[model samples]
Target: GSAVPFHGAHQAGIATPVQDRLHFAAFDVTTEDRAAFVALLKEWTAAARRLTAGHAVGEGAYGGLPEAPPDDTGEALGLKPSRLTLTIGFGPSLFTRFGLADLRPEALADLPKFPGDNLDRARSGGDLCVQACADDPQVAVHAIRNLARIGFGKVVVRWSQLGFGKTSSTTPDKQTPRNLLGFKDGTRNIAGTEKDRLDRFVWAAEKDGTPWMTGGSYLVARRIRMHIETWDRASLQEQEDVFGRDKGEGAPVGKAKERDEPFLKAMKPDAHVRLAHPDSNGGATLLRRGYSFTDGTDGLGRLDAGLFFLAYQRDIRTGFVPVQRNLATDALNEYIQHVGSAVFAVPPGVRDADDWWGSTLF
Candidate 1:
């Protein structure tokens, strides 16, 4: 799953049309464990390749940049890293689970329940087969529910990254939405230039103590569930206040000019209509890459959709944590909640297959 898993079965509009038709899971392995991890992946890819008769194509080690070779990917470059993700697809079996099958009952009596307890429990019991489907969305969800039927755990969050889009370069394209939020999100979040990249996404050098991790990257996954219905109910004016821009053009609220618009021009102190105050402590920004997914439809006209938020930065303290803690009281908090989370340090690139993790920073 190099982001969105597209195989032979994927049509031009099929993915976007059936939003929840896909399922995803992510994981990372230690750098010193490269041999074991690569071996494990080779086995999985071989099995999947044979099963799909080659239709199930897969990319093992990835090239960090588009033009690089497979070995150029960080994992192959000797950055003993632990951030590996698997995404899978689900097929027609949606009917079996949602319509014909009987969901297993759990012990809820006398059990401590919180606002998002159900979601928390589901994520705690994650499934491996589901995680393995980074190459097949149709198989991902089918396997997830089937496994759940027999006692496999649930995956609380689903994620997609910014690098999935096939653009000419790594430039930020906010006009194009990332996999998480359906409303053309990420317009204001991506790094605007190479300079911004240095500010937003930075990798430590040898002087940082972890000499081996000089060129290595990191993976940060945070579960941010949005309250769509609640957001939808608010007036456009109020909505613009919260986002600091109009919902359509994503333009600043009062600015007639586009390029001249300041990021937080709308956040004036004591402004009666301010969605974000000038002095809001959590108003700092973080690059967000995520998508919206509905786990299971209520069948009675209800849908559970929210943000599977993912972000990457050099320092978690100033990058994501501060902004998240600040958002604890944002207007958006009314609809969203943080249920599941994890963080991993991705190592620099490996040089060769034989070189392995110990050859570098280990």
Candidate 2:
């Protein structure tokens, strides 16, 4: 598909097919004037609508007033849409400006610090975040670049992450993908086709007292850095015990097939799959859309690579928070330390041509 229609009740990227690449950026609000900030949001939304359709941001990138800087960056001049999708989210920090304190969704609460968290302030929180994903890495990059250019003085990026090789998939049927650890991840993830499950476990609704987020969802992103050197030295059996799934078939300890039902007790009590299993998680489920990344090497000569865990849920308190608590004791935790974390309230999508991002919240 060259283009994914941008207008809908909920954003396209959340449930749309996982793209091959990502350009996720978190930005700090630099402007204090509510009207100016709102103006930027509206401008961003309009450009996003054009960007996702494979069109230039404004004036076709090359044809703007010759004396003026072109509205489009011109790098993506010949590119197709490549199924691009841009999703926006507002963080807890955004409420302070714009008198939006009361509009903040309860589920948009700041992510609580988890155990073994080696967080970096530079990479963590932000007032706003834009998740740009596309089949072509350049397409994703171009989208973010243009958005940031448009933001200019209104917002500045706090941190940006570029990722390839998606770790999670909404489409569960077509061969599940593996993370950096070489194990099939999110085998039991929610299928995008499952509308009932999406409604019940993924989408937010009016009953939650936040009407603006009724059709939207909550996003939790964690930059979990893996101990590549340490994990490489781990014995195959040790790896299996940690994940509770065989390396080759990804079959559970007591199962013969990857999709076969897993027996929790048969595996170690600290096995990741057992603890992360919905049955073990009080029925809390997360729609994972993660990606694997390798950002060169850490200063210690070890490879700095891991999964950028992106999860969407109806509420973080009932979804990620509870399951992550259960995972504190997981065997895999030793191999992965969450280094960055951010939570955002994803408002309902631009329902029509006139609707812009954050329109509901504003």
Candidate 3:
């Protein structure tokens, strides 16, 4: 009952219903040889399958060969699987370095500089990415640690994020989680059971001229820093006005229930929901799998905390860019700024036992 299935038509992490913890990492490819990198990818996939099924990688941690190094990291020893899922993605910058320029999908375009963006280059982009999520935080971190150990020379760690208390959920039937701002997140989000909606808004298709990305999807990661100090000082009405939803009930403006349809005109002109709503942004939809994060202090008497936004979509041009552009005028802009950003072309899932992560692309 505790173990989540590992193999699927699409990756497990995206639509498997959001977990309680996240340990996401982006890596920089160090080797120029494509063969060496691909070799590591295969090994990483083998390790991922074992770990996800509540088993150690390659050999048991303690009883491996006496002289040879242990294949598995010992931290996860005697630990429950906790439903750990590891997903991999290739960045736009990866194509230029490897012999994959011709295979680069147009949907993998670099994200544009949106208004109110204060991007940090050090933690933004990378050649490859791994998203680790699990019910237990240690299980999530252990997956990435083992993968990093296997690819020590071939790939170097670029930047990583630790998330707790998932802000959004794919399983809407379950309780909707809240973000740091104390608002119920993923109220109207696409659900894992919505098959038609998943195909239309979340999954990439072969009809889009990229056969390699048939079941894949594009991933957009943004580190949106929240201004908690400023928000704490705001009036209750001001906070409600910015979100266009009541705090306690999470209902839209002028509505009594959370699921009731929002009357846009009743909401503030620059309200976040008013601008970011599909009715306002050309019907652009995305599958949000975001999480709330609190990393120590910001060195200025404030917590360095925010929402780590993770969204999956069919295409970037039609999905994310247009929606984000419309949000430039949102009143919530005052309380948050995008500090880190990245775009990755997530390849199709490992279909069978013989299939690997990037097999379709290669």
RMSD after CA superposition, every candidate: 13.9, 1.1, 1.1
Tens-digit lDDT track of model 2 for 1-362: 38988999998889888888899999999999989998998899899988998999977787667899988988888899999999999999999888998898888766777889999989998998999999899889999999999999999989999988888888877888899989998788888899999998899999988999999999999999998889999999999999899999999897889989888899999999889888998999999998999898888777789999999999998899989999989999889999999999988889898888888788
Task: Please write out the lDDT profile of model 1 over residues 1-362, one tens digit for every residue.
Answer: 12332222111111111122224443222223434434544444333332223222234246345775432112222221111223222211211232312211111011122334234533422212223222334344333333232221222233322222211112343234433222335444435355455443444345645554454333344455556667678786676555555556645667653333454645543221233231343443444434455555546676755555544444455455555544544655555676655444433333333333222322
Better of 1 and 2 by TM-score: 2
Better of 1 and 3 by lDDT: 3
lDDT of 3: 0.90
| Candidate 3 root-mean-square deviation in Å | 1.1
lDDT of model 1 at position 8: 24
Candidate 3's residue-wise lDDT over 227-285, tens digit each?
Answer: 99999899999999999999988999889988888999999999988988889878899
Give the TM-score comparing model 1 with the true structure, all chains together: 0.54
Scanning candidate 1 in windows of ten residues, the lowest lDDT window is 103-112
Give lDDT: candidate 1, residue 333: 54
Model 2 regions more than 4 Å off? none
Question: Lowest summed lDDT over 10 consecutive residues: which window, candidate 3?
Answer: 1-10
